[PDB]
Design a protein around this ligand. Structure first.
Ligand SMILES: Nc1nc2c(ncn2[C@@H]2O[C@H](COP(=O)(O)OP(=O)(O)OP(=O)(O)O)[C@@H](O)[C@H]2O)c(=O)[nH]1
Ligand SMILES: Nc1nc2c(ncn2[C@@H]2O[C@H](COP(=O)(O)OP(=O)(O)O)[C@@H](O)[C@H]2O)c(=O)[nH]1
Ligand SMILES: [Ca+2]
Ligand SMILES: [Ca+2]
Ligand SMILES: [Cl-]
Ligand SMILES: [Mg+2]
Ligand SMILES: [Mg+2]
Ligand SMILES: [Mg+2]
Lengths: 258, 437, 53, 418
């Protein structure tokens, strides 16, 4: 019988994850400050990473990466992309730190920003949820999902979402995450980590993707909470705490020799 | 040649003490009966090992050590053990009735009874020192003697030897081997009282040592005997510079200078490698590159914490065995580009290195395998403050209900000292927070 | 990466490599001890008194 | 902190004390003549904790046998190990105590108590370092209950800084001798709350139910109940009788087990009545508790487990860590790591391995409520009081005892909600 603790009640996502764990009759919820837990759905600020992995007889796992805020903080991210040699001053996909020439959907002559959900498990596998969403201005949901935004591209521009956009997105995600892996990985650490991230993008008229910001405590599109959350417990929680397809995630792996 | 006297307090200190001296003797080629063939200056000398051993006309090398415990059963083992001949009876002091895992009992009640005797038996060692450096105090945080009597001793050493340096080897409490529920209390109480009187303290968390034994020595359920031998090795590396010809950390003052910018932040993290099973049929010897790399694995530290999420104020590398600078530099070259090694912006991001060509010595019939090179890394990282955090939380939980507090007040202490000691620890956790920011 | 202050002897060597530049008195203790001692003696007195009652 | 002085008082007290000595004597390789015939030497390594050394390498129990009538003590002096006790350490009157606490505490007992303290004294004076006293007795009679708590008070006076530990058999209607047992028990509990550091609450209810439902004995005798008791007493004292690091003496035990001075009444448990997993499940279930309380009706403040025999230390620790992790609700959150485990290589007689449980649970309040309920049912109507007022006692004394125990129950409850 695996035990877990909830320390963030405002979490749209993990509140749903909690429901699923109870719904498997093989996970029981302890009081928020009981230390004898397997899993911690910890708080948003001042998560006491210092008191994890110190309970003998318990494999302990938490749903946040200590240090990942460097990515999730406007000022930190910007600082990270410059100083970080691997990212370089170079890197086409990041604004100098506004887009005067964004892409536009028709009818409506409207702009938008893309949101992709990424899961990084304890082994630092990078998983990209096959479903994203667009937050559009209905002025010259508003929620636009891939199937139809893919269909639109095949019509308006004679191309696909995969080719014109999703290749760069996967590149940006892989670049930002594998850049800070040495600072946050829990590979030989006394506790384990996983975390759901939200990346926000822009697409200029030339169909070039641009990174906006990264959120470490993202919500989800209403109808997707179900599918995504099941995936979170599937590949991030059940993987460390096994129970007694067609994955919804694209495993971002790429090893070019040179 | 300046002498160094060791003081082993309580069961942990005594039992760990007995292991270090067994090791030292093996390392300096000193036999149980105390004879030392390779030593040619009979009944005298100012060699490097004379800082830890004195000589008698009969050619016996006597540890400059005092064992203290408020109960005799543990020290009685020394009196009758393999090295009974080594020590002189005056060096082994025992009381009748222990502190019952109670700081207040060890400090106030029973401490007052036995303190003066101890200071005398120590004075007798000091009188035989031409240039005493200071003391190395070994003890636990959790024991009543180890916590309560030690801090009294430390207070009084600072009086009777105000100029001398005092180093600490402290066993930080771990439930997997802890013997008491109140060890959090004792830990804070002894830290608060000893803080100003300790120049440099090396914390060894039994949790970390326990797992290293399981993980690397394939020991199902480690005993103190296992724990103490790994601990003895780490201690040996740290004191080797004082016992062998060298130029790094040659005296107790140098430890302070090289590892302790701020007085209150005097708890250097130690990391040791490699630790290999003796019952290991086939082993492939590790290089400078590999062992220097392990020094940055939390799984090899004496305290489980994450330096990646803190800043360094100093870092010091002590090698033993087949090593030369080029290899160390080249190993450091690589490591820097593959790790998150961040110093406080107001310090040089460098490494003070020391190599003793003599590879680590292991006890015959021990769990540790012989290696050709090893390394202990002392680094003052703010990350070790995680250990104060864990402790301060456990303390807060119990004290909130005043659980067990009556046992301390009953011995003459006062609830006040509980909250004073806790506030000071709150300061410590903040001082680390600033430096570390 | 500058190696400095290299020292060599028969049993090893040391050096430094830099990567990048930037008390209570005797009386004072006896009183606390005696202060606690009396508090003990007092509590014992209260007990023996209570028993006497 | 080496020698313990053992005192046994009254019929019950002497009957369980006699078995305790027979049992541990066996474990330590001592025979009825006092001669050692053991194969191991762990048997002798701490033999001084309970035995003195007499002439001719004879070990004599540091035991003092008390009673206001001769019968039961004459019975002991005839039993198997009857010749092992120092003849001088038999102290008895002729009048008896008539199952009356007042007679044991105030009248018949007062007359006998000094001669007992004379023996207690000579045993103490030849102690290299006495740690404290352990008393065995019932709380429902008169000698063990009334004189026993009288002894405790005097002993504390003459040894204020030593540890007082008792094995106290609580009365139950299911195994009753007289109707005034709730009076005697209530009066004693009040003495115990003030004058002991640790008390093992051995409930005659629990002991009977265990003999009937589990051991399947259709009609159990006091002898049967005393088989369980002597076995439990063996287990809970193992850490004091053999080389160990946990609760190795009475004071360290008290420091680990008693977070608040008044809450020192323990719930013992034993198993079996066999893999490490099976030991660890049984020792923890109600049906192995020697106090008729449901631990699931309260929370644990502290717990002391002891495993005996050759077994895997790794598995013990796995099993102990797992019981807590899987019921972490019943252990209080404000005392980190309140469960301590010990292991001893020497198992009891006839068993390959066993486990002994000692729990400071807040469910223990149920035992005090039961007594309080019985006590009140009679006191309300002042029934059977004349037996006590005839010895000089006043109602006021009863009203206090009732109140002081009600408090005790209120304390256990407040810490169950914290
Ligand atoms: N590493 C190691 N830890 C020990 C050893 N002995 C005891 N400890 C630890 O020390 C703590 C208990 O303190 P002790 O040193 O045993 O007790 P003490 O200092 O003798 O004080 P009292 O016995 O209470 O008078 C526990 O946390 C133990 O895990 C040892 O030999 N090696
Ligand atoms: N378990 C057990 N309980 C006993 C025994 N003898 C008496 N009792 C209980 O103790 C109470 C009677 O007290 P007892 O010791 O006989 O009277 P005392 O000699 O005046 O102290 C009742 O609750 C009995 O059930 C015994 O041998 N074993
Ligand atoms: Ca010499
Ligand atoms: Ca008379
Ligand atoms: Cl001086
Ligand atoms: Mg924003
Ligand atoms: Mg001890
Ligand atoms: Mg009777």
């Amino acid at each position: 019988m695996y035990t877990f603790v909830v320390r963030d009640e405002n979490s749209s996502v993990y509140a749903e994850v909690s429901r699923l764990l109870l719904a498997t009759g093989q996970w029981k919820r302890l009081r928020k400050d009981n230390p004898r837990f397997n899993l911690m759905l910890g708080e948003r600020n001042r998560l006491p990473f210092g008191r994890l992995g110190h309970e003998p007889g318990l494999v302990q796992l938490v749903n946040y990466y200590r240090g990942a805020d460097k990515l999730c903080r406007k000022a930190s991210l910007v600082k990270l992309i410059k100083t970080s040699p691997e990212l370089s001053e170079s890197c086409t996909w990041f604004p100098e730190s506004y887009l005067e020439k964004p892409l536009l959907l028709e009818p409506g002559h409207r702009k938008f920003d893309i949101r992709s959900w990424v899961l990084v498990d304890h082994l630092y596998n990078i998983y990209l949820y096959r479903e994203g969403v667009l937050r559009t201005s209905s002025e010259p949901g508003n929620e636009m999902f891939f199937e139809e935004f893919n269909q639109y591209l095949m019509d308006a521009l004679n191309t696909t979402l995969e080719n014109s956009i999703l290749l760069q997105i996967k590149h940006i995600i892989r670049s930002c995450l594998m850049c800070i892996e040495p600072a946050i990985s829990t590979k030989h650490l006394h506790y384990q980590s996983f975390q759901l991230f939200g990346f926000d993008f822009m697409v200029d008229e030339e169909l070039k993707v641009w990174l906006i910001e990264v959120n470490g405590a993202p919500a989800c599109a209403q109808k997707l909470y179900a599918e995504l959350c099941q995936g979170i417990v599937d590949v991030a929680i059940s993987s460390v705490f096994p129970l007694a397809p067609t994955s919804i995630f694209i495993k971002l792996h790429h090893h070019h020799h040179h | 040649m300046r002498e160094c006297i060791s003081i082993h307090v309580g069961q942990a200190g005594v039992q760990i003490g007995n292991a270090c001296w067994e090791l030292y003797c093996l390392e300096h080629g000193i036999q149980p009966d105390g004879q030392m063939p390779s030593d040619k200056t009979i009944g005298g000398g100012d060699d490097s090992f004379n800082t830890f051993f004195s000589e008698t006309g009969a050619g016996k090398h006597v540890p400059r050590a005092v064992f203290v415990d408020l109960e005799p059963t543990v020290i009685d083992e020394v009196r009758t053990g393999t090295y009974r001949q080594l020590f002189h009876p005056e060096q082994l002091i025992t009381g009748k009735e222990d502190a019952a895992n109670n700081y207040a009992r060890g400090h106030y009640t029973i401490g007052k009874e036995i303190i003066d005797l101890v200071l005398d038996r120590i004075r007798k060692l000091a009188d035989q020192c031409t240039g005493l450096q200071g003391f190395l105090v070994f003890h636990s945080f959790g024991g009543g003697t180890g916590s309560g009597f030690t801090s009294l001793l430390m207070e009084r050493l600072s009086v009777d030897y105000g100029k001398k340096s005092k180093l600490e080897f402290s066993i930080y409490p771990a439930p997997q081997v802890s013997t008491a529920v109140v060890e959090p209390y004792n830990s804070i109480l002894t830290t608060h009282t000893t803080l100003e009187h300790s120049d440099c303290a090396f914390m060894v968390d039994n949790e970390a040592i326990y797992d290293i034994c399981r993980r690397n020595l394939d020991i199902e359920r480690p005993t103190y005997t296992n724990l103490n031998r790994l601990i003895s090795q780490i201690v040996s590396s740290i004191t080797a510079s004082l016992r062998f010809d060298g130029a790094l950390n040659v005296d107790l003052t140098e430890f302070q200078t090289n590892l302790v910018p701020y007085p209150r932040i005097h708890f250097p993290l130690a990391t040791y490698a490699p630790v290999i099973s003796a019952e290991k049929a086939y082993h492939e010897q590790l290089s400078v590159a590999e062992i220097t790399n392990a020094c940055f694995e939390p799984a090899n530290q004496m305290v489980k914490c994450d330096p990646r999420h803190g800043k360094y104020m100093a870092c010091c590398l002590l090698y033993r065995g087949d090593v030369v600078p080029k290899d160390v530099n080249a190993a450091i070259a690589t490591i820097k580009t593959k790790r998150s090694i961040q110093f406080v912006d107001w310090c040089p991001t460098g490494f003070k290195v020391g190599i003793n060509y003599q590879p680590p010595t292991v006890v015959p019939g021990g769990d540790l395998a012989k290696v050709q090179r090893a390394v202990c890394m002392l680094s003052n990282t703010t990350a070790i403050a995680e250990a104060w955090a864990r402790l301060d939380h456990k303390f807060d939980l119990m004290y909130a209900k005043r659980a067990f507090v009556h046992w301390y007040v009953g011995e003459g202490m006062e609830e006040g000292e509980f909250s004073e000691a806790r506030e000071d620890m709150a300061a410590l956790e903040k001082d680390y927070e600033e430096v570390g920011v | 990466m500058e190696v400095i202050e290299l020292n060599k002897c028969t049993s090893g060597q040391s050096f430094e490599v830099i990567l990048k530049p930037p008390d209570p008195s005797l009386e004072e203790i006896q009183k606390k001890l005696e202060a606690a001692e009396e508090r003990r003696k007092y509590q014992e007195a209260e007990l023996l008194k209570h028993l006497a009652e | 902190m080496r020698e313990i002085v053992h005192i046994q008082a009254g019929q019950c007290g002497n009957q369980i004390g006699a078995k305790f000595w027979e049992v541990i004597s066996d474990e330590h390789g001592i025979d009825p003549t006092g001669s050692y015939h053991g194969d191991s030497d762990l048997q002798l390594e701490r033999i001084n904790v309970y035995y003195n050394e007499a002439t001719g390498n004879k070990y004599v129990p540091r035991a003092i046998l008390v009673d206001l009538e001769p019968g039961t003590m004459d019975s002991v002096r005839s039993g198997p190990f009857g010749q092992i006790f120092r003849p001088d350490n038999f102290v008895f009157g002729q009048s008896g105590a008539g199952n009356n606490w007042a007679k044991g505490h105030y009248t018949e007992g007062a007359e006998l108590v000094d001669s007992v303290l004379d023996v207690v004294r000579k045993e103490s004076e030849s102690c290299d370092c006495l740690q404290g006293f352990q008393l065995t007795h019932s709380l429902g009679g008169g000698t063990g209950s009334g004189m026993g708590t009288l002894l405790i008070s005097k002993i504390r006076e003459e040894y204020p800084d030593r540890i007082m530990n008792t094995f106290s058999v609580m009365p139950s209607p299911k195994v009753s001798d007289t109707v005034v047992e709730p009076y005697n028990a209530t009066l004693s509990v009040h003495q115990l709350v003030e004058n002991t550091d640790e008390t093992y609450c051995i409930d005659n209810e629990a002991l009977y139910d265990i003999c009937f439902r589990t051991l399947k004995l259709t009609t159990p005798t006091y002898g049967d109940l005393n088989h369980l008791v002597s076995a439990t007493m063996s287990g809970v004292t193992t850490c004091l009788r053999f080389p160990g690091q946990l609760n190795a003496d009475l004071r360290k035990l008290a420091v680990n087990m008693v977070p608040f001075p008044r809450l020192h009444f323990f719930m013992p448990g034993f198993a079996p009545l066999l893999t490490v997993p099976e030991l660890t499940q049984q020792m923890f279930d109600s049906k192995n508790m020697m106090a008729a309380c449901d631990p699931r009706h309260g929370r644990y403040l502290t717990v002391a487990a002891i495993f005996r025999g050759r077994m895997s230390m790794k598995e013990v620790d796995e099993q102990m860590l797992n019981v807590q992790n899987k019921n972490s609700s019943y252990f209080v959150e404000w005392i980190p790591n309140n469960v301590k485990t010990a292991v001893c290589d020497i198992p009891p007689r006839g068993l390959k391995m066993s486990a002994t449980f000692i729990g400071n649970s807040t469910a223990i309040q149920e035992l005090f409520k039961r007594i309080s309920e019985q006590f009140t049912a009679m006191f309300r109507r002042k029934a059977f009081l004349h037996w006590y007022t005839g010895e000089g006692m006043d109602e006021m004394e009863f009203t206090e005892a009732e109140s002081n125990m009600n408090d005790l129950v209120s304390e256990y409850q407040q810490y169950q909600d914290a």
